């Protein structure tokens, strides 16, 4: 039972175009279980989740109602922020928040988080001890004085030390048949001629989960971490992920290279090389 | 379970 529950909030003002947009998506490691969008036509969570829909209607209505209270809070924040930085009313701005908690196999809380960002730049975050703040610039300092004067940290610490943890090890049990699982990577190595004296050796890893993974090449045992092209881990569109590492090799020594794959869904790190046919 | 924030920045 070693995972983490995290929420990613977004509030983007749309002056001169309409009303603000708000999104709040929930995550349990690399699996999204809930989604709250202010553009939704009927509150149905276009991201629903098995183990979530098994809770009553009280739960779904309760969360839906909290989310809407939060759209007002963030609407007040955008307007205050607009003032702290002396911005006009027309400019579109964004406010994002990231909060959650991590747990050990124990099941207990390992650490809690609560960070905010304005227009893509850090603004204010909650400290390791969950009792103090760290304001980036002098505007966040305004929010700092305000929050401690009202002793806001205590409500954040309480959510993280309680609700966050309590509900996590409830989603873990109600979905132990999906959240504690690991899908191993399918791996093969392709060969793509560049010309007469060169050719690319691409190592693929497909259909795995979680997203975490490490692809490494090697030339006669030497790590080629430097001259290796490596793409960003990408979703396949089915809860699974992909990634590939590539190295350029001279036509002929393409047997000296080996690809190494590390992944939780793997019993032991894998070693592979290109095989003609 | 969403956190209910009421204190704006």
């Amino acid at each position, epitope marked *: 039972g070693s995972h983490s529950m995290r929420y990613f909030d977004t509030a983007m003002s749309r002056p001169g175009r309409g009303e603000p947009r708000f999104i709040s998506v929930g995550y349990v490691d690399d699996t999204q279980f809930v989604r709250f969008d202010s553009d939704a036509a009927s509150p149905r969570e276009e991201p629903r989740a098995p183990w979530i829909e098994q809770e009553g209607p009280e739960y779904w209505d*309760r969360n839906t*109602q*909290i989310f809407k*209270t*939060n759209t*007002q*809070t963030d*609407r*007040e924040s955008l*307007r*205050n922020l607009r003032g702290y930085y002396n911005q006009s009313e027309a400019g579109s701005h964004t406010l994002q928040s990231m909060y959650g908690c991590d747990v050990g196999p124990d099941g207990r809380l390992l650490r809690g988080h609560n960070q905010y960002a304005y227009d893509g730049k850090d603004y204010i975050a909650l400290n390791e001890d969950l009792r103090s703040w760290t304001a980036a610039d002098t505007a966040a300092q305004i929010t700092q004085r*305000k929050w401690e004067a*009202a*002793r806001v940290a*205590e*409500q954040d610490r*309480a*959510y993280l030390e*309680g*609700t966050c943890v309590e509900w996590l090890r409830r989603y873990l049990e109600n979905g132990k048949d999906t959240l504690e699982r690991a899908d191993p990577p399918k791996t093969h190595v392709t060969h793509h001629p560049i010309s007469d004296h060169e050719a690319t050796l691409r190592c693929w890893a497909l259909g795995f989960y979680p997203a975490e993974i490490t692809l490494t090449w090697q030339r006669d045992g030497e790590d080629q971490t430097q001259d290796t092209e490596l793409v960003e881990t990408r979703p396949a569109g089915d809860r699974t992920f992909q990634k590939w590492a590539a190295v350029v090799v001279p036509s002929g020594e393409e047997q000296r290279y080996t690809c190494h794959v590390q992944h939780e869904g793997l019993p032991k790190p894998l070693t592979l090389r290109w095989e003609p046919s | 379970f*969403l*956190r*209910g*924030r*009421a*204190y*704006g920045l």
Partner: T-cell receptor, first 111, second 112 residues
Framework: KTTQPNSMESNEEEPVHLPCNHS???????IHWYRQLPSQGPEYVIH???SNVNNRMASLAIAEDRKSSTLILHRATLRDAAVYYC??????????????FGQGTILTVHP | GVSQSPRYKVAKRGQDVALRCDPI?????LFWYQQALGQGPEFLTY????????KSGLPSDRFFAERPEGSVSTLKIQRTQQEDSAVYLC???????????FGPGTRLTVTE
């Protein structure tokens, strides 16, 4: 929604213990207290979450399970005579600050 | 502190009345409450700057509130009825969740 005694008595120079019950409170809910002196507007007294919030004139003690609380005036005076209200403005996250004064408690301070 | 006017008002059943509120300068949030004898104040409407975001407490259509530049606020009542007799309170604050500072309120009485 909270419930508290309709009235309470006390003599000047004495600590006053105003009780309050809030069974369905949330973990994110704050306990606020307001009072209203005769023919005046309501005014803020104190507010807390879990730990005891102390202050010169009034302190607040919150039950461990948080389903009940007490507002503590360390030394009542005639000016302390008024209506006290126990409130949960955030309502578990379903509200934003809007105040729901209930009936409150009318505190009479006898000289 | 917060100011309200008029402090007192007597109205004939059926006429319209206008109450005014001047919140502490700079305060973003502004709330309206209605308090009848022996009862505690009752939420009426709320303002986030100039925008009225919660009017869940307005008894009917007869009640209309505004706050043009997000400062001074007006509460107008059309066709006053006896059930309208109460003290109308006004409170402003730094933000929706911060401590509210109330005004002396307007004591309104509706007679036949």
């Amino acid at each position: 929604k909270t419930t508290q005694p309709n009235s309470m008595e006390s003599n000047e120079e004495e600590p006053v213990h105003l009780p309050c019950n809030h069974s369905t409170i949330s973990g994110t809910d704050y306990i606020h207290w307001y009072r209203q002196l005769p023919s005046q507007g309501p005014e803020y007294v104190i507010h807390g979450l879990t730990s005891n919030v102390n202050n010169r004139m009034a302190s607040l003690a919150i039950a461990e399970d948080r389903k009940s609380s007490t507002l503590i005036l360390h030394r009542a005076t005639l000016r302390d005579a008024a209506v006290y209200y126990c409130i949960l403005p955030l309502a578990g996250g379903t509200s934003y600050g809007k105040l729901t004064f209930g009936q409150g408690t009318i505190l009479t301070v006898h000289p | 502190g917060v100011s309200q006017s008029p402090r007192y008002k007597v109205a004939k059943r059926g006429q319209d009345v206008a109450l005014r509120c001047d919140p502490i300068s700079g305060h973003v949030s502004l709330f309206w409450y209605q308090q009848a004898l022996g009862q505690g104040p009752e939420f009426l409407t709320y303002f986030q700057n100039e925008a009225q975001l919660d009017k869940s407490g307005l008894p009917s259509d007869r009640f209309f509130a505004e706050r043009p530049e997000g400062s001074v606020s007006t509460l107008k009542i059309q066709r006053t009825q006896q059930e309208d007799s109460a003290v109308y309170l006004c409170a402003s604050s730094l933000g929706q969740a911060y401590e509210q500072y109330f005004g002396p309120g307007t004591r309104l009485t509706v007679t036949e």
